[PDB]
Every structure is written in C-alpha cells, then in structure tokens.
C-alpha cells in the first residue's frame, strides 16, 4: 500500500476546479476552473506562479505540451486556446466546435492537439497553425475524454453514448469500438485503456485483445466525468476521484482499495499523478474550490 499524506492545499480559484495536470518536466501543476482561468503552481512546494486569462466562459480541461512550454485549454466558449506558459500569452485560438469543448490533449510529439466536445465530434488540430486537420463523426452524445497513446499513432475517445472508440491519428479512421463512459486513457506502457463509466466502475481493458481484464469498484461516480490515472512511479496503482469527496487508490493487479485520501469537501473531479515522484494532485467542485497535493513513500 502507498501512504499518501496531505502536504499542501492550494486555494485561489473562485469557482469549481475542473482539471489539474502536472507538467511533463515535473516542475509545475496547471489547474483550470469554471472561473475561466488557468493557474500555474510549483509542483513540489505548491507556490502560486501565475494566472492565465482570456477564455470567455469556464474551462473544463487543460493539457501540457511535451516540452512543458505550452498549455492547451478547452472551454464552454466553444474554443481551445494554446498558451505560452512562460509569457502567459495566447498563441492560437482553435475554432470550429459548435458547442462546449470538454477535453483536450497534445500528442507526444506535441505537433497535434485532440479535442472532444458536446457537439459530439473529436477534432485533430495542428499546433503551429491552430487550424483543424480533421473532424471525426466520433460519437452520438457528448465526448467525455480524448487521449493519444504513447507514439501518437492512436487516439482513444469516450462518450455519454456508452462507447469507447480507438482512432488512427493519421487517417482519422475508426480502428475499433470497445452506461455513459465518462473517462478513458491509455496506460504509460501503451498496452491498456483505463475506462470509467457512470455506474461506479473503472475497468482496465487490453485493447489489442479487446477484452476487459480488471474492474475497480468501491467509489461513487454516477454524474460527473472524473479523471483517473495510472500511478507508476512507486507501486502500480489506479487513482481516481469520487463523488463522496475522496481520492481512491486501488492496486492495479489485485483490484483492492489500498488507500482513500480524505479532506476535500466536494466531488473530487480531477486527480493527476506526478511524472517522477510519488505525488498526487486532486481538485474539487464548487463547495470546495481547492487543489490538494499529497505525498507518499511508495
């Protein structure tokens, strides 16, 4: 079992926090919020660094480029923005979705962004131009998550239509189709997809074999698209937020709950795992509005 302990609470957003993500270089944490802002904090000391503003409505997700120099944000204003983190400048506004943009991610090369929207499409955009390369007829209800795999050749998407689909990046073609599916992501090894469904379940899928290998239960997730993670820096865990205001940590192999992290006062909508240290960041909704940083020995 790990032994995560609360280290810091980061206050400052004035509405629900929607997403927290560590920079790939491990130095920063970015947080987005329904307050239309992105804030950047020191990953290790929790020190407030800067606020980044410019979206017209709240933000539901943010993601870092591989070099930790850029951030992309997905907003209710129907756009994504690419930001230079050191200057705080908006470099590009990505326009074309017809409804809220819900989720976003860079590829590993960081020349492409993928986004998912309430308009039920997945779009692939070029970073340097900020223009849309492809719009995929991906789902029949809002798209809850999009993620590239470890070489950027695949995209996984999920939706309130109950489907998870895997796409070929280069062609936009659907390669495989795997309750609303509220979150998906590829594993760090590239071999599995972790999928969350709004029936209080997380499931580990072998996507080559198209089979479910493991189910994780115990938490509450019936209403919100909560992020989950593979934690691989210490022991091999699955980490997720929960609607009972706790962070859950399961053993990836045994499926047992190994720890729950207590302290938030509303739904824990987002958790992120530090790329090299045993550090988790978590964030919560409107009755809480805070980010918590937790540290473990394994």
């Amino acid at each position: 079992k790990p032994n995560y302990a609360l280290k810091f609470t980061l206050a400052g957003h004035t509405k629900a926090v929607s997403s927290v993500k560590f920079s790939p270089n491990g130095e920063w944490l970015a947080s987005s919020s329904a307050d239309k802002l992105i804030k950047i904090w020191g990953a290790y000391d929790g020190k407030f660094e800067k606020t980044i503003s410019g979206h017209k409505l709240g933000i539901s997700d943010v993601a870092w480029s591989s070099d930790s120099n850029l951030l992309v944000s997905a907003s209710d204003d129907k756009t994504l923005k690419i930001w230079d983190v050191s200057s705080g400048k908006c470099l590009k506004t990505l326009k074309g979705h017809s409804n809220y943009v819900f989720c976003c991610n860079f590829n590993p090369q960081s020349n492409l962004i993928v986004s998912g929207s309430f308009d039920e499409s997945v779009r692939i955009w070029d970073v340097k131009t900020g223009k849309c390369l492809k719009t995929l007829p991906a789902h029949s209800d809002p798209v809850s998550a999009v993620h590239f795999n470890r070489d950027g050749s695949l995209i996984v998407s999920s939706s309130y239509d109950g489907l998870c689909r895997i796409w070929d990046t280069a062609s936009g073609q659907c390669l495989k189709t795997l309750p609303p599916v509220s979150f998906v992501k590829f594993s760090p090894n590239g071999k599995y997809i972790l999928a969350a469904t709004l029936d209080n379940t997380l499931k580990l899928w072998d996507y080559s074999k198209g089979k479910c290998l493991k189910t994780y239960t115990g938490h509450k997730n019936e209403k919100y698209c909560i992020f989950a993670n593979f934690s691989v820096t210490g022991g091999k865990w699955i980490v997720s937020g929960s609607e009972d205001n706790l962070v859950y940590i399961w053993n990836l192999q045994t499926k047992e709950i190994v720890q729950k992290l207590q302290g938030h006062t509303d739904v824990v909508i987002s958790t992120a795992c530090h790329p090299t240290e045993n550090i988790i960041a978590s964030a919560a909704l409107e009755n809480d509005k805070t980010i918590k940083l937790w540290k473990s020995d394994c």
Binding site: V17, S18, S33, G58, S60, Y224, C225, L285
Partner: peptide
C-alpha cells in the same frame, strides 16, 4: 461544463 465538467463542473456541472
């Protein structure tokens, strides 16, 4: 939207 994610927060609602």
């Amino acid at each position: 939207a994610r927060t609602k």
